[PDB]
Structure formats: structure tokens, C-alpha cells
Structure 1
């Protein structure tokens, strides 16, 4: 009889753990694409701002700011 109750509460527990973790995995990957969305989109403003003012000086004079 002690094994019957161990099966009942094991069935109950795994129904919950499964139903929880599967739903938490949806939230986990939504945070990811939002994280990736940020890192790549702030990397655009970094590159483009570097590219604009790298040509203003010119890639012929920038070699003469640390000699």
C-alpha cells in the first residue's frame, strides 16, 4: 500500500513539474530573441557611428595619432 501512495504522488508531482518547466521554456526562449535583438541592434549604431567618423578623419591620417 505504501507503494500505491508513492505512485499517486509521483504521478501528481511529475504532471506539475512537466507542465511547469515546459511553459517556462517558452518564456526562456522569448528572453533570448529579445536579448539577441538588442546585441545586434546596438552593434549597428556602434559600427555605423564608427564608420562615419572613421572616414571623416580618413584611413590615411588615423595612422598618425599614436606614433
Structure 2
């Protein structure tokens, strides 16, 4: 019976952690895109100066 209750709570926890880490990955990718845009535009205006 302890095995069955562990199976239920494990399945719920793993679905939660999967959804959380998926959206965290998407938002970290968007932060990466904004960061590299910042770096290349400041580098370009430095080179032109």
C-alpha cells in the first residue's frame, strides 16, 4: 500500500516538475536572446566609435 501511494505522489510531482522546468527553459532562452542582442549592439557601437 505504501508502494501505491508513493506511485501516485511520484507521478503528480514529476508532472509538476516537468511543466515547471519546460517553461523555465523557454524563458531562459528568451533571456539569452535579449542578452546576445545587447552584447552585439553595444559591441557594434563601440567598434564604430
| TM-score where L is the length of structure 1 | 0.72
Bigger Rg over Cα = 1
Q: Unaligned stretches of 5+ in structure 1?
A: 50-67
Which whole-Å CA distance do the structure 2 matches of 1:8 and 1:42 have between them? 52
| TM-score where L is the length of structure 2 | 0.98
Q: Unaligned stretches of 5+ in structure 2?
A: none
TM-superposition CA deviations, 1:16-41 (whole Å, max 9, x none) = 00010001100000000100000000
Which whole-Å CA distance do the structure 2 matches of 1:33 and 1:47 have between them? 21
Provide runs of 4+ in structure 1 moved above 3 Å.
none
Which whole-Å CA distance do the structure 1 matches of 2:45 and 2:34 have between them? 17
1:48 aligns to what?
A: 48
Alignment: residue pair count: 49
Which whole-Å CA distance do the structure 1 matches of 2:44 and 2:19 have between them? 39
